[PDB]
């Protein structure tokens, strides 16, 4: 009986996140199609994403439940088709600002996609089902990225005919998004805890660590273009992302098998992997050889994703499902006030306006300071 809302909800998930034109984005933008100087992309367009993401996070979390979860999944499906329709024909610097804002809805409505399964599926088939709707997404993005590089390299297909595939992909994700059964019970509308030492401490690291990761993942495609321009040499943006995401997926899976009490060896295993990111982030900025630049990204994504699993596992050990939304909803929101303040100072045209060349030397110093405060705190 649970196979009907997991076949469609998963089918919607896979096709939505199978976007071949995610890796070849900046090389697509700063090309012969929508020529935009790198100073117009790293300081005027990209920052708008986090501004809109933060604004449309509480209003979409609260709406997602005053209405069903499927309605917001359909609101995320339409915002997938607008964003990628303006990215096809929309040109300028002002239009791309709108595109980012719509992309704010695309990813700020992602809360309504995971949380949907809880309401319509029997409670006992939750942990097992959540894996199906999470493991499928990673398979989609990995399959999408491989397809991008395996075509641009052997098929000689221009970057423009990658967003067409992306638009066709999301356009068929939407067609399914109408068939999920309309849930008949919400969590809060239609149905203090932080005092615990472990929850506050573990959650704080989750907020800080993800805030720096969303920023890197944002401004870590200009750097590759900066070190080796797309118009002068071949770029393996797709292969790197596919291997990187796969590297992350395996790391998350491994943390779920090795049985070690993450209480006495948690903080040390947290700082040790935090200085792996800070030590793997400077490598991006101090090397001229492009190949080394990817190797830094392979380590960073896999290493960090091996920490979010530790944080996620420790946060949710005494919390019931109904509590998940209000503890991973205020972690996903607090982590954005951190990014927005960081993007208004380190990147945005209003603030220091630092270009990408000097920009990564800050994030490398960002993950490095999270270790100093989470390691020297253990004094006596």
């Amino acid at each position: 009986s649970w196979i009907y809302p997991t076949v469609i909800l998963c089918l919607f998930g896979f096709f939505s996140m199978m976007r071949p034109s995610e890796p070849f984005l900046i090389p697509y933008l700063s090309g012969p199609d929508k020529q935009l100087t790198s100073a117009e992309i790293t300081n005027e367009i990209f920052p708008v994403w986090t501004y809109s993401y933060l604004v449309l996070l509480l209003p979409v979390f609260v709406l997602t439940d005053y209405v069903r979860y499927k309605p917001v999944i359909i609101l995320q499906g339409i915002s997938f088709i607008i964003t990628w329709l303006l990215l096809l024909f929309g040109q300028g610097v002002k239009t791309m600002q709108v595109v980012e804002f719509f992309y704010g809805m695309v990813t700020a409505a992602e809360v309504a996609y995971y949380a949907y399964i809880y309401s319509v599926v029997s409670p006992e088939h939750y942990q097992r089902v959540s894996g199906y709707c999470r493991s499928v997404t990673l398979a989609a993005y990995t399959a999408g990225s491989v397809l991008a590089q395996l075509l641009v390299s052997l098929a000689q297909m221009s970057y423009f005919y990658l967003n067409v595939i992306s638009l066709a992909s999301v356009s068929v994700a939407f067609l399914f998004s109408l068939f999920l059964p309309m849930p008949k019970k919400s969590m809060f509308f239609h149905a203090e805890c932080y005092s615990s030492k472990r929850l506050f401490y573990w959650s704080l690291w989750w907020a800080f660590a993800t805030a720096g990761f969303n920023q890197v993942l944002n401004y870590v495609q200009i750097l590759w273009d900066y070190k080796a321009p797309s118009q002068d040499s071949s770029i393996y943006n797709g292969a790197v992302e596919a291997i990187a995401t796969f590297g992350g997926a395996v790391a998350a899976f491994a943390v779920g098998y090795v049985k070690v009490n993450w209480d006495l060896l948690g903080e040390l295993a947290l700082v040790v992997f935090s200085v792996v990111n800070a030590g793997s982030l400077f490598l991006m900025h101090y090397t001229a050889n492009i190949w080394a630049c990817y190797a830094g990204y392979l380590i960073f994504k896999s290493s960090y994703m091996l920490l979010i699993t530790i944080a996620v596992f420790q946060i949710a050990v005494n919390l019931n499902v109904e509590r998940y939304a209000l503890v991973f909803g205020i972690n996903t929101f607090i982590a954005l006030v951190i990014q927005t303040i960081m993007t208004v100072i380190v990147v945005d045209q209003r603030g220091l306006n630092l270009p990408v060349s000097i920009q990564f030397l800050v994030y490398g110093s960002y993950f490095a300071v999270i270790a100093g405060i989470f390691l020297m705190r253990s004094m006596y």
């Epitope: 929508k34 020529q35 935009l36 100087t37 100073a39 117009e40 024909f89 929309g90 040109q91 300028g92 610097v93 002002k94 239009t95 709108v98």
Partner: nanobody, 122 residues
Framework: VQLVESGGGLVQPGDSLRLSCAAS????????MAWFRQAPGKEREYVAQ????????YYAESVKGRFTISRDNAKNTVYLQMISLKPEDTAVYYC????????????????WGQGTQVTVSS
């Protein structure tokens, strides 16, 4: 916007020139002005760029170091200063103004100029 280009002429290599672009009619929205070049029997080539609100510039790799593009909003012209011409720089120069606002089209640059001829030979 009605861009009008002038300042071309014939000169030996190693001779500097300045080109202007008197955009006029709809200045209030011009968010860039990038010069373009088309050598005989060839295709348009990127040559320069200048934002209007600020002063960021981005020159083509081949022409960098000798081409400087400077804005003058008071009269709305855009000056491209070129130094050290070579016997393979011969071409015609075109302006390209980005008006502004949300648009759906084939190319970012909305309005273009007519064309000025630069001939470097002996």
């Amino acid at each position: 916007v009605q861009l009008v280009e002038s300042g071309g002429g014939l000169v030996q290599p190693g001779d500097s020139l300045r080109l202007s672009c008197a955009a006029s009619g709809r200045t209030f929205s011009i968010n860039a002005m990038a010069w373009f070049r088309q050598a005989p029997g060839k295709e348009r080539e990127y040559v320069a760029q200048i934002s209007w609100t600020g002063g960021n510039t981005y020159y083509a790799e081949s022409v960098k170091g000798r081409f400087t593009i400077s804005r003058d909003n008071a009269k709305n012209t855009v000056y491209l200063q070129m130094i050290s011409l070579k016997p393979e720089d011969t071409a015609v120069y075109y302006c390209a103004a980005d008006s502004g606002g949300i648009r759906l089209g084939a190319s970012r640059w909305n309005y273009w100029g007519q064309g000025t001829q630069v001939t470097v030979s002996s």
